[PDB]
């Protein structure tokens, strides 16, 4: 990172939309019920040809399927340069979907949390505990300077306070500056101490149906809808995919290249 | 592609090896027999830890396994920024080793061929026909200027001249300027008309045991033996992997980034 | 010398060349020929060494300067090879199945080494630099290594269970183990059957020339995968009979020793310098 | 850096004296004690080596720097001794019946020897100068010699008949033969149980000291009758208990090392002269 000096009289360059469409890849994540309703084995080819009409080279649009929001929330691996997640809306899962967005619309720096030997705390409002697995049931016992527990006994987990049960993904936020003993099913869950660095610009979430319920910020005073959080009413999935294809330029305009240099181990679908 | 003007007094920068390892990744391709002899369920983990001692961050080194040279030759996909292929030497598979090395050490620009409709010819010395699949059998019938076979009958394919039998990968080089009718088992193998653009500088091949027998150029008058074609003597595979880990600095020094802009969206690892 | 080793030597680029010292070199030097037992078997003669001495005399050597050290095979000769003469010419026989052993022997005798004892039963060992290796030789040498970590715990192997260690050498007369540098390794070796030393490669030998009889260029005297230097002291010939090989060696001894340099023979005959 | 050349070194007669290097020498060097088995039996303590190491530590030697090597007796030790430490001290018990054997042992280890092979079958051998000797080692060395004349016929001997050869060694573990220089000799040696080498005495071996435990001064490391030099590395002590001997060795180790110098042939400056 170096200072960048620019002249306000500089001329705008031509549109780079065609070049980025040519040199980038698009990943679409949709629920399995979409494929079920569409009921066509060649719909991937059809959408690829339509995207080609929109400018994307054949083979650069990758279609990925997930069973549901809860299943997809277990270590979501976003591959392409541009990722669009068609997330079905369920009034009962408002938190979970929000968490999923909170997981994929932001960059997270995470380190392992070996709870069974160590005591942990959250240093600042950017710190959270992200737990992912088949079943994440997390109980918390706040502690104090004398190392005793408040309304909890370290020797009896039954007295721990319940913050998660049977979760595929959950973001736990506790009071900062306080040590907590943790009890999570390590067999079916992995908990990580994470810091949200900032927005993840290459991931857009399109909520299919419902209303604006997403809250990607733990602060109760903010519920910001960024340009990467779209929301479309629906009755047929074919119309949903047609509107995704037709307004692909608008969707990618709302997104930007990831720009982060990572330390992780994930594959990517790039050109 | 613009001219670059440089001064012969510009100060050398510091070593980029540390940041290169922290920002790049290493795919190591080994045969199945290597894992069989190692006889450990966690040799990947210890090799990754040793690589970390050598500088690479955890999860950056990828370990891919192939049954043998023939099977690996069937459309090999190279994922990491730096690819090292440990190829065992067999005195009876020199041409197959050479063809694999040619395919993965050079950059190729390929287009499909329709052998059942049109006749084909090779324009210049860089033009070849690469056929790969489960079983490639290619027979050729050179035609004269009256589109009539020479020493072959266009109607009868039994008179055709056999250039490949049951191969999994074969690079066919015929006389340039002559139209050839091709009889290829398209049901089990695909043939593509390709041009050699240049070297793939991100792929190194380490020949385990044997002699210098590789020939990555069809010209009889050249056997280059470039700096990306190493050879070692061995008795045990653990020694081979320890040598690869210890001298990974030299291996990566012998390689450079791919530098080619691709029109194809494939699966890669990139940190 | 020592007190003037770090002193410059200045030469003028017009100093007249001295005459040939080849004749005076042969009259004050000793030549050692190392050949396999099968060479003597195929020759099938008892006075052949005397005839070779007389032929070398025809080539300018005094009687008493050429010596012939027979060795059974490469593997046995690889156990503490001893270099006796001013000039050593080792006739190695090529076998496709013993490429690594040939390379290890050439590495041992074509280079200077500085070795120290390794009491592998008490301490763990590292390899500090790319010039550091572990050279082990004996009747039979099986080496098992367990890399440790910063906490001194084995990686991929239990520090207490040798069965989990990693095999890098099985029943070796000679083996040069190269491990990842900077990592502590617990070792277990058949100490009864072989000795293992921590060795450092100082540089070439310059008085040992290895002639490979038959085969292709397969020797690799450097552990670095991206280098296979073919120095002027590692020669290769094609053969159908051993008398022709010996006649070639005698007739081109001028060329063979022009490719070697005197002053490199150590007081000891060992292929390595040793410090305890 | 300039290894093959002897460059003069100039020094001013008034520069300074650097500080004592004894402490650093003891910290970065290794000491080896060679003693007879009967010493160990008389001491009759299992942990005595540990006690001696502790006592040396009191004198500034880091633990593990001092080594103790056992040898059965003078004759057995004389068979190809291998002194590998930086500093070597050999406690040699005096036997009035083994005066020449002790002299030969000391001459072998207190001097520097450059040895070439000898093939008694092929060649007849001369000794060129006063520094040329024939050193033979083995389980049993029996050397008989027939001096020839200018016509290659024996003098007081027949080359074909070894029974007439003049015996100069019988069942020796080590023997240094000195014969008349400039005379070709035919040698009969028990090659099965003995190897003979044509050796040149280059000079003193600085880093080897011999402490004679017992009788008067009898060692003669010089083949010349007119001189029997007693160098500062040839110590002599009167004894009644081996514990007393070892305590004397430990207490005066400063003086013992002061009487010795780093082996000139074993440090980098010796590179491309003979060894390292
Ligand atoms: C930009 O668009 C204009 C308008 O057609 C065209 O003339 C020009 O070549 C394009 N490229 C650049 C680099 O300005
Ligand atoms: C480069 O290395 C030098 C010396 O190793 C050091 O002073 C300097 O800070 C390093 N970084 C840069 C950017 O020059
Ligand atoms: C060197 O060779 C030349 C010509 O063969 C001869 O005249 C001369 O005496 C020789 N010796 C020396 C010391 O130059
Ligand atoms: C040498 O000895 C003197 C006097 O004891 C001391 O002051 C000095 O630090 C020592 N070291 C050097 C390098 O002179
Ligand atoms: Ca949840
Ligand atoms: Ca409670
Ligand atoms: Ca908090
Ligand atoms: Ca909020
Ligand atoms: Ca093939
Ligand atoms: Ca035909
Ligand atoms: Ca062609
Ligand atoms: Ca070629
Ligand atoms: Ca070997
Ligand atoms: Ca293991
Ligand atoms: Ca190493
Ligand atoms: Ca090499
Ligand atoms: Ca007689
Ligand atoms: Ca004797
Ligand atoms: Ca004499
Ligand atoms: Ca004397």
Curated annotation (Swiss-Prot), chains C, D:
Binding-site list for Ca(2+) 1: 45, 156, 164, 166
Region (LVD motif): 187-189
Domain of life (superkingdom): Viruses
Disulfide pattern: 32-85, 115-199, 141-194, 146-157
Keyword Calcium assigned: yes
Post-translational modification: N-glycosylated.
Cellular component GO terms, alphabetical: host cell endoplasmic reticulum lumen; T=13 icosahedral viral capsid; viral outer capsid
UniProt-annotated stretches for the region CNP motif: 115-117
Glycan attachment residues as annotated in the record: 19
Any GO molecular function: metal ion binding
Positions of the UniProt region annotated as GPR motif: 203-205
Binding site for Ca(2+) 2: 127, 178-179, 181, 251
Chief subcellular location: virion
Biological process terms in GO annotation: receptor-mediated virion attachment to host cell
Annotated keywords: Calcium, Capsid protein, Disulfide bond, Glycoprotein, Host endoplasmic reticulum, Host-virus interaction, Metal-binding, Outer capsid protein, Signal, T=13 icosahedral capsid protein, Virion
Similarity comment text for this entry: Belongs to the rotavirus VP7 family.
Other observations noted: Some rotavirus strains are neuraminidase-sensitive and require sialic acid to attach to the cell surface. Some rotavirus strains are integrin-dependent. Some rotavirus strains depend on ganglioside for their entry into the host cell. Hsp70 also seems to be involved in the entry of some strains. In group A rotaviruses, VP7 defines the G serotype.
Described purpose of this protein according to its UniProt entry: Calcium-binding protein that interacts with rotavirus cell receptors once the initial attachment by VP4 has been achieved. Rotavirus attachment and entry into the host cell probably involves multiple sequential contacts between the outer capsid proteins VP4 and VP7, and the cell receptors. Following entry into the host cell, low intracellular or intravesicular Ca(2+) concentration probably causes the calcium-stabilized VP7 trimers to dissociate from the virion. This step is probably necessary for the membrane-disrupting entry step and the release of VP4, which is locked onto the virion by VP7.
Subunit structure: Homotrimer; disulfide-linked. 2 Ca(2+) ions bound at each subunit interface in the trimer hold the trimer together. Interacts with the intermediate capsid protein VP6. Interacts with the outer capsid protein VP5*. Interacts with host integrin heterodimer ITGAV/ITGB3.
Protein's name according to its UniProt entry: Outer capsid glycoprotein VP7
Species for this entry: Rotavirus A (strain RVA/Monkey/United States/RRV/1975/G3P5B[3])
Location of this fragment in the whole protein: 51 to 326 of 326
């Amino acid at each position: 990172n170096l200072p960048i000096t620019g002249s306000m009289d500089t001329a705008y360059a031509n549109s780079t939309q065609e070049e980025t469409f040519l040199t980038s890849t698009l990943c679409l994540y949709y629920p399995t019920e979409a494929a079920t309703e569409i009921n066509d084995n060649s719909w991937k080819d059809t959408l690829s040809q339509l995207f080609l009409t929109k400018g994307w080279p054949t083979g650069s649009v990758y279609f990925k399927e997930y069973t549901d929001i809860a299943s997809f929330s277990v270590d979501p691996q976003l591959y392409c340069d541009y990722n669009v997640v068609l997330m079905k809306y369920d009034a009962t899962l408002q938190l979970d979907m929000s968490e999923l967005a909170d997981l994929i619309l932001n960059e997270w720096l995470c380190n392992p949390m070996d709870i069974t030997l160590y005591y942990y705390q959250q240093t600042d409002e950017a710190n959270k505990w992200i737990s992912m697995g088949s079943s994440c049931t997390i109980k918390v016992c706040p502690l104090n300077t004398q190392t005793l527990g408040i309304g909890c006994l370290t020797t009896d987990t039954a007295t721990f306070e319940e913050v998660a049960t049977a979760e595929k993904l959950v973001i736990t936020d506790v009071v900062d500056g306080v040590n907590h003993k943790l009890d999570v099913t390590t067999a079916t869950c992995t908990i990580r101490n994470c810091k949200k660095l900032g927005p993840r610009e290459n991931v857009a979430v399109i909520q299919v149906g419902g209303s604006d319920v997403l809250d990607i910020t733990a602060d109760p005073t903010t519920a910001p809808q960024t340009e990467r959080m779209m929301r479309i009413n629906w009755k047929k999935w074919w119309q949903v995919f047609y509107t995704v294809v037709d307004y692909v330029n608008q969707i990618i305009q709302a997104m930007s290249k990831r720009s982060r240099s990572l330390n992780s181990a994930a594959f990517y679908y790039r050109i």
